[PDB]
Nucleic acid binder design. Structure first.
Ligand SMILES: [Mg+2]
Ligand SMILES: [Mg+2]
Ligand SMILES: [Mg+2]
Ligand SMILES: [Zn+2]
Ligand SMILES: [Zn+2]
Lengths: 550, 344, 548, 345
DNA sequence: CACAGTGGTAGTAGGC
DNA sequence: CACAGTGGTAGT
DNA sequence: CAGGATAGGGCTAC
DNA sequence: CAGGATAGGGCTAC
DNA sequence: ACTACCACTGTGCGGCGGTAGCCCTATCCTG
DNA sequence: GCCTACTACCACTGTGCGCCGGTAGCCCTATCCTG
């Protein structure tokens, strides 16, 4: 058996995206050309998966998890969670397959076991320790589309998916002295780290379905919040505290799950209880107050109306919390979608400056379209940016460039507008590193140190030279970028680190697998995609694939 | 029998299985909307005004004295003495069940619109565990009145509940909670006649009695053709309840009860088997101690319906039945459900 | 060391492994076993040269007309010197092609082993350098929805055109005998639709399409007039070529054969018949149309020597207004035949559910209600979901007596059930004839009966389904009913000659352009074409079939 | 000078670079549609009708005796005395070149709708070549007319053409073919002052001399600012030709000529070089045997034009120039070309 | 009748 | 400042 | 007042 | 005649 | 044989029947 | 009787048709009733 071990053949099948079918082609090809089993056959790879999938590593929660089965052998269970897909009940157009969040976290830890010990060593600590860790977990839910429903027996699932996925961001054990980072995901927004936890064939807007599928995960999360995980690793019974930080949500999704009105609401932030008006007036001095506890208290105020206020007075009392939060999201900023929305607003700004609406407030819809097409043709000519329908982050960070503003200026016959746009983008690029860094304390401390001032300049610039488009109407993401990013860094140390960029990047893999690494049946697509996406995110296999360096 | 389709513009996306219709003095109002109350209708309650066979879900509003209740799916809705629809249980869009009772009155009608005083009637005593698919129904006995809450699927107890089966429901132990909404006291009255728990049973409230009828016992996963009659005398102190397993009941579930005329209720729609609906309506003649479930004539059920795997609806309250079925999701946001209206 | 570079390449391409993912696997296997089991990317790249065109020497006894003799040209620009000057016609195009000469010799030298094994298998020799009458199924196919890329390049459409060719049948002369040396067992396999031009254009863009393809058409026409002396097994073997352009969708056939669009009253690409004259006769239509006949008819249109009005002239040329650009063979796209016939049966179900045989005048929204009803019932009964653009899988799960049984649950009239069930029975006794790669063997009963089954299908379309096929028969019903037998007599098969291989190669085009290509407009087509040639390499496929 | 954004609702996708407008009876007619002639217009010729800055490509019938010509891109379009246009060369939609001459007269006109007689003249003798981007323009020497054809791009000669460079274009050997449509006897003329093949050169024929302005010589890949006046003699006998490279020539290619006034043309810019298009018009005043290339007041070019990379168009015919620029919103279905009209007093 | 997967069972060849 | 490719070429 | 354009929709293919 | 619904469009996010 | 570089990709929004063409007929639009 | 390899088998995938700004929601204002 001078070939490979099954787990390494699995790491290859996975990180190289090889399907079990194509991997089998390769394995039999090498086994028939060389004769020897260089690669291990598929049954061996599946026996290895069984180890990397949840439901293998035993574990215990010193306070047993309330409403969570103590069984340590449950892997890809149904996300419906016994949801009666009966005809008398609410319909279930949902193929949901999930790992049990505790089993999942156990597998994620035992997967990075080697890395945790590596850090405990590199952190001048004893890699035999069992001290109480603190695993910070960026739970990241995101809705997906164009998820082509498959033919075949199964519910009439929508062409939408929801990918809940927790990224083990950092593990810090307290060595008496202080919580030292025995592990920190260097690439936190990576697709290799946001470990899937629940693949729904649902719509993130379908609160009924979404909640039916997630309330299990939410129960497990609220339980692990109140229980240690004395799972054994490195031969020792380590014990982990879990700090789940639900920041990898689209703002739309946060508002869905934190009980807030849509993004267009007058109440604009998922962080502060401010209005789009107060946010276009102040734009900076806004303190984070919106918390899941506060959102729940405010929904109970709404529901109860203990002060018997009209819907307006009430909605103000609760500051937009009409719905009940069922996900404890931490008030933060999806750096991915902050960048996308800010680049969309800068794209609109370019359209407008091309229209000089600072002079011509009124404007024709077809003339706004003409400005859009002019900007499109230019960005294609100068910045080589094809005109995209739906703003993405790549188009954004190619648009959030002084070069794109140089190009746009060619279309602005107004040098004062040139300067306004160039200063605006200078500030936005002196700020974007901060809410877009995985670690601005070191990646861009020059900016973070001057973020509040740069954002004050950006705000007063929107109020001086982009007076249009920003008097009583500032985008939610502009408000977040300007007002909260400093506080989000003082609280979490980073923002990009805590973005859905990982979950979304993993939607690419969801599709890749559903098409190339899953059984093409509604009964088995989510199970298989979840299995394989987990494997992909397994630091064990990623190690075995980093062995060229190791 | 007068099956006529209904067209709906915007807000169609709000009508979902589990919605309830409350008929306040001929004005029918939709309550249980898909997702939480949007700032278009922060109250979640609507005017269910149909007009030329086109339904306009006109956002209603609550009062100051109100409690902006959640959109409850498959709650227990019942008229009341004025005319305050009791709403117990129901799956909030968060899937959670609402032990709270929500008493929707109508406080203002100066405008052409209405304004509900949805109060929260907190319950005391042997309160019913959070449930849905159940039947609250007001029986007026010796003048005094009580709501008869029976049945309904509910999430497993916080002890036996698990996340592998977090949403797995069990039919609430078959009890008939007696609720004095004048004092908000439930009175559990476990009955030997009701062996199997029920849910999605229609239930006909008549003076001093309530005919539980045609449910689904998730335990047996079968729809018993039972016709339990729960008579409720109210001698001051503790009221005296007693059931009666009458025959002739129809094995149905998720059916819509609709008082066509007085003492007679049509039972349209529902399901006889998970894969076989109840295409046959059923009139129900009632006396003070009589009941006769006369199989109505089958309406002109369109193939739109006959071939739908499921369907749902609620009684508009004027002998009328609003009836939805899953439309063609040829696209994602094409049309939530095809809707229909039956007059009887 | 057990793995030769060609074998690692076969693994990389047939397992769709990207050079990056293959490199990960390679460095990992080499860090784990220590052995360099997998040959490195550079070795695979040097092996590709052997498989890509422009490696094997060759010569055409008659040196080709207007084709360079250079046997050292591979992924050349499909623009073909097309002047991108602003003065000229713009080029919204990223085209990369193999020179059909080099492409074909690479396909042959890739089937070298297959050809030799098949001539051995046919009582033949290896000392037999006889003229192999290669048969090359040309398959041009517009893809669409090809997400264009940012970056430096022409503002290409979000479309493509995949000209390809499947070497379907190599037959050699043996005295008077024509011996089928090699016959593609999976004709419409994406493993055999050798891509020949990948142009990020639009088949609707006849100007661009033609600028990119007319070099291929010239190479093809010159090969039709010559003989390829290619050195296989150390023997210089001659290959005559017969290009059958059949993997063209009828829309592209009509584009490139000078014909009016599909909606034309001139209904076929094979016969000169009329949309009406085909809703009445429906079975009896000699294949008249031919690229030569269509050029004659185009220059007759242009010249108008009989000085005819546009209508009389059009009926004289029978829709050949445009100039035939490609020598398309008057055949059927079994794939698009299935798709169109099944969309027609789908409309038929919509209408029977509408009983329009009784209620001809029906509301557009009622026809939508019927579409919805059928959608719901097919999702329920036949489990197959409502799709916007009809595909072949739908057209195979729908063209089934199971499906008509499900539909009849939606029609009250039992005589309509009889009509639909007989219609489908005939369509399913006919389909095997124009889907089977050789119905003479796979379904000879359905073939010898195809004339009668088609007469019956037509008479039932006229009688029971006159509400839809009186004076208006679809183009593919008229191909299925009237021309299939003549094509089988001629081609010997139809499914073997479909755009199903090219169209399935669209899947690989996307998979590569997304995973196995430099994501840049400068190179996406070059790399996709390289890798889709390799994927199609019978050499590598053999290496991947060594376990068998 | 007077710019106005023309709208084209239907059949806009037919307008393609290389299209030719032809002014018959003052009514302007489009030719050279994208793709081949669709049954909406089996001829390819259209009533060009701008009404209120909206263009309506109204299909145009041909005659019985007519030769239904292909949509030629970048052909040589000249005019006559009933009034018959002459269309030589051009890229068929099959990107093959035409060697035919197409004499597109008007056969009749009723209800503003015309039936043309697009007859085909075949050229005996020194038939030039299949070419495009060239200039055909007619001279009236001794009253007798003659079509001066000065070269444009062609495809390499078959002996020299190769499929790896199938669409490679060579500026035809710069000759001057004298097409006597009375007999279709083309007569080549190798002028030593014309030693650099030209194309997309605007040719202005006044009485007996054609002024070749601008042009692109791919042989040099440069746009020579040359002003070749090709004077033509058709006396009783010897058909003679003498070219003189006047000064004042302009560096343009694909430029658009219009006879705004009598012997007062306007060359609204084509291209100064590939990615520097001539956003400055050029008035051209032609004395009987003198020519001055002025420079008009450049129109208020719309940013859509200034910021464009290419632009095309042709002579509406009176004093107006129909222009088109890539719209490139998505260049998929809606509007692949933003079109303008440019009047001149 | 397209075809090459899609991968996890299940059953069946082998070993021992 | 996402990040893991995308593959050939050039450069170690 | 009827002839011609013409917009729209049904129909064919993609 | 002004109050209320309401349709539409601009705006926020996806 | 490694690795960098280039100059970008997809995942990040969603919906919905669409084009193009053709051909016939219900408007419309004249004079 | 254990394990190991191989392969059928399930019932389906995508590639086959494009096109475009869209939905959901919010909310604020021009329409539009509404007698
Ligand atoms: Mg989302
Ligand atoms: Mg095509
Ligand atoms: Mg295609
Ligand atoms: Zn805020
Ligand atoms: Zn035919």
């Amino acid at each position: 058996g001078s070939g490979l071990q099954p787990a390494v053949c699995l790491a290859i099948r996975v990180n190289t995206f090889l399907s079990c079918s194509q991997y089998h082609k390769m394995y039999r090809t090498v086994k028939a050309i060389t004769g020897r089993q260089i690669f291990q056959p598929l049954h061996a790879l599946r026996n290895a998966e069984k180890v990397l999938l949840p439901g293998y590593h035993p574990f215990e929660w010193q306070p047993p998890l309330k409403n969570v089965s103590s069984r340590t052998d449950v892997g890809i269970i149904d996300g419906l969670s016994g949801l009666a897909s009966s005809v008398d009940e609410y319909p279930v157009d949902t193929i949901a397959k999930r790992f049990r969040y505790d089993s999942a976290l156990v597998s994620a830890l035992m997967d990075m076991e080697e890395d945790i010990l590596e850090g405990m060593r590199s952190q001048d600590l004893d890699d035999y320790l069992n001290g109480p860790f603190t695993v910070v977990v960026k739970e990241s839910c995101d809705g997906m589309g164009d998820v082509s429903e498959k033919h075949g027996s199964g519910p009439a699932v929508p062409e939408k998916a929801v990918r809940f996925s927790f990224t083990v961001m950092r593990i810090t054990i307290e060595h008496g002295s202080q919580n030292v980072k025995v592990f920190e995901e260097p690439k936190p927004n990576s697709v290799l780290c946001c470990k899937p936890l629940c693949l729904m064939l649902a719509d993130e807007s379908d609160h009924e379905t979404l909640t039916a599928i997630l309330s299990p995960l939410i129960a497990e999360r609220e339980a692990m919040k109140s229980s240690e995980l004395t799972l054994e690793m490195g031969g020792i019974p380590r014990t982990f505290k879990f700090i789940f930080r639900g920041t990898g949500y689209d703002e739309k999704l946060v508002r869905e799950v934190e009980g807030l009105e849509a993004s267009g609401s007058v109440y604009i932030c998922t962080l502060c209880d401010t209005t789009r008006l107060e946010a276009s007036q102040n734009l900076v001095f806004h303190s984070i107050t919106r918390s899941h506890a506060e959102n729940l208290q405010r929904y109970e105020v709404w529901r109860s109306n203990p002060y018997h206020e009209s819907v307006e007075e009430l909605r103000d009392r609760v500051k937009g919390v009409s719905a009940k939060p069922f996900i404890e999201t931490v008030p933060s900023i999806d750096a991915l979608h902050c960048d996308i929305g800010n680049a969309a607003e800068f794209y609109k700004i370019f359209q407008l400056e091309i229209g000089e609406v600072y002079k011509h407030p009124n404007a024709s819809k077809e003339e706004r379209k003409r400005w859009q097409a002019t900007l499109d043709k230019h960005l294609r000519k100068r910045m080589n940016l094809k005109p995209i329908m739906m703003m993405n982050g790549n188009f954004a960070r190619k648009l959030m460039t002084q070069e794109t503003v140089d190009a746009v200026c060619e279309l602005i016959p107004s040098e004062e507008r040139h300067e306004a746009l160039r200063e605006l983008m200078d500030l936005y690029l002196k700020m974007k590193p901060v809410w877009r860094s995985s670690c601005p304390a070191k990646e861009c401390p020059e900016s973070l140190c001057q973020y509040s001032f740069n954002s004050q300049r950006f705000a007063e610039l929107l109020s001086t030279k982009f007076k249009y488009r920003y008097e009583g109407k500032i985008t939610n993401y502009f408000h977040k970028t300007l007002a909260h990013v400093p506080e989000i860094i003082e609280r979490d140390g980073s923002i990009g680190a805590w973005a859905s960029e990982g979950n979304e990047s993993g939607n690419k893999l969801f599709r890749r697998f559903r098409k190339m690494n899953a059984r093409q049946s509604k009964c088995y697509e989510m199970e298989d995609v979840l299995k394989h996406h987990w494997l992909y995110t397994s630091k064990y296999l990623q190690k075995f694939m980093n062995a060229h360096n190791a | 029998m007068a099956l006529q389709m209904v067209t709906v513009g915007h807000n169609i996306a709000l009508i979902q299985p589990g919605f309830s219709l409350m008929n306040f003095d001929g004005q029918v109002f939709f309550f249980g909307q898909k997702g939480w109350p949007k700032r278009s209708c922060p109250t979640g309650v609507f005017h269910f005004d149909i007009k030329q066979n086109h339904l306009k879900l006109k956002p209603a509003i609550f009062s100051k004295d109100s409690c902006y209740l959640p959109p409850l799916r498959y709650p227990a809705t019942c008229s009341y003495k004025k005319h305050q629809y009791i709403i117990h249980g129901g799956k909030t869009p968060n899937n959670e069940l609402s032990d709270k009772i929500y008493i929707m009155s109508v406080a203002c009608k100066n405008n052409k619109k209405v304004t509900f005083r949805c109060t929260e009637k907190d319950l005391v005593g042997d309160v019913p565990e959070p449930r849905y698919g159940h039947s609250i129904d007001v029986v007026y006995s010796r003048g005094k009145s009580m709501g008869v809450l029976f049945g309904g699927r509910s999430y497993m107890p916080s002890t036996q509940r698990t996340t592998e089966k977090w949403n797995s429901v069990a039919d609430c132990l078959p009890h008939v909670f007696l609720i004095d909404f004048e004092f908000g006291c439930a009175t559990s009255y476990i009955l030997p006649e009701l062996q199997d728990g029920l849910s999605f049973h229609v239930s006909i409230a008549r003076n001093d009695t309530v005919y539980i009828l045609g449910g689904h016992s998730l335990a047996s996963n079968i729809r018993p053709a039972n016709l339990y009659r729960i008579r409720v005398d109210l001698p001051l102190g503790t009221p005296a309840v007693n059931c009666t397993v009458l025959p002739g009941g129809i094995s149905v579930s998720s059916a819509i009860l609709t008082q066509t005329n007085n003492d007679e209720f049509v039972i349209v729609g529902g399901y006889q088997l998970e894969n076989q609906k109840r295409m046959v309506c059923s009139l129900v003649s009632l006396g003070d101690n009589t009941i006769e479930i006369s199989e109505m004539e089958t309406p002109d059920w369109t193939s739109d319906i006959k071939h739908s795997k499921i369907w749902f609806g609620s009684n508009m309250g004027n002998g009328t039945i609003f009836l939805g079925i899953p439309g063609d999701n040829k696209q994602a946001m094409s049309e939530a459900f095809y809707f229909y209206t039956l007059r009887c």
